[PDB]
Amino acid sequence: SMTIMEVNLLKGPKGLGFSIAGGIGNQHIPGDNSIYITKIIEGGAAQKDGRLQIGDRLLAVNNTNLQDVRHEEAVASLKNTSDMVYLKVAKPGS
Template structure:
């Protein structure tokens, strides 16, 4: 989906009933994490298999969500949009736009709901610390290694 173009947009209403795993899709975008060039909207990143959205069949990856239960999503941060989805209740009405003309600007891999930026930074920090320890061990024992050759 990265770098693709879209055609004439269409807007439709989709009603979903929240299942055991929520609404069954991940979102990307927001004013703080633009997914489309010059567009801070909220987009469907991934439809989860056997989730409410997949079972309904109308929502598709790449759709722009304009409203949830009548509340507009424009000008929201990503986290504010996530909180709005989580507090939307059991019966959820989405106003969805499919199509458009802006090329995709976002990452080709979407971060799962349960993977926060802090988690990613923690993994990066752990990898860097491991590299430093290995470098120190190498420098400390390097003279001994050379003596054996």
């Protein structure tokens, strides 16, 4: 089974503060189109909160499922969010 966590972040003065890779046409692992968190930016909301980690797979932002999307669409979904943002992640499985 998947180890799933839900994290609600307030963007704040420095924003959510994490980078993502992966996506359709931009695979992080061969055969895997998942979106992966690759950096936690110093000073951002993700760092302050502490729950998100490099290596997490970003499953959804609010009501938008990101399990099989283009990287550009995943980035857009993160930017199309208001001050409180629901993030659902899978922790490393393997």
